[PDB]
Amino acid sequence: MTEYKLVVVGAGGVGKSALTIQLIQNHFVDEYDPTIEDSYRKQVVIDGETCLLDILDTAGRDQYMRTGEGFLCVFAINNTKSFEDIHQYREQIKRVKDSDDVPMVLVGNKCDLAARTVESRQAQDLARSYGIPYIETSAKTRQGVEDAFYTLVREIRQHKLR
Ligand SMILES: Nc1nc2c(ncn2[C@@H]2O[C@H](COP(=O)(O)OP(=O)(O)O)[C@@H](O)[C@H]2O)c(=O)[nH]1
Incomplete structure (x- = not known):
């Protein structure tokens, strides 16, 4: 079996x-320990x-970026700061990867919310x-969640085939 x-x-x-x-257990968990x-x-x-x-659920390391084959760069559509932080995350990934094109998917989460700022x-x-x-998601309603992770796997698949 191929592992991603x-x-x-x-x-x-x-x-x-x-x-x-949501991907793993098919349900919305809130207040999950932010430090785990x-x-x-x-x-x-x-x-x-x-x-x-x-799937490595980072909480906030080039160590794990190095081992990672694909990355979900997530921001919240109601938090502009998280969106602008995307640049920094991508730069870190490219840096440790020594590559210009690493499998990545930009995810705009919390699309179920009305007060959109991005x-x-x-x-x-x-x-x-x-x-x-770019894929918008909602961990609450599950909209686009499978699309997000599966699209990243396809990006990795294509990267490997090249
Ligand atoms: N409305 C809404 N709230 C969400 C959504 N996804 C996560 N949250 C809430 O955002 C907070 C942080 O989520 P969490 O997964 O702990 O954030 P993380 O720090 O990136 O791991 C929690 O209170 C979640 O319930 C979403 O799609 N919609």
């Missing part, structure tokens, strides 16, 4: 744990291929500038 090492990064509070748990950092695994079928996702178009354009996909 995924790393979820982003400012505190954007919903990294909630996203990971661990990896979660799930065997799934993506595009006819059975694989094992190994427009989808802004993120879309930034992602396009980075050459990566």
Whole structure:
């Protein structure tokens, strides 16, 4: 079985744990200890291929960035600061990876909220500038969660095939 090492990064509070748990347990967890950092695994079928996702839920290290094959760069659509922090996360990943093109997906979480401060178009354009996909999600309603992680796996698959 093919294993995919995924790393979820982003400012505190954007919903990294909630996203990971929703994927794994299919339910919305709030108030999850913000200081806990661990990896979660799930065997799934993506595009006819059975694989094992190994997801590191970061809490805030080039060590794990080095081992990671793909990265979910998450920000919250109602927190502009988390969006601008994306640049820094991507720079760190590229730095330790010594590569210009590392599998990455820009995730705009909390799309269920009405008070949006980051427009989808802004993120879309930034992602396009980075050459990566942009996917809006909601760990609360689960909208786009599977899309986010599965898209990253496909990015990794394509990266490996090159
Ligand atoms: N409305 C809404 N709140 C969310 C969503 N995802 C996470 N949260 C809330 O945001 C807070 C932080 O989430 P958490 O997963 O702990 O953030 P992290 O620090 O990135 O791991 C919690 O209070 C969650 O309940 C979401 O999609 N929608």
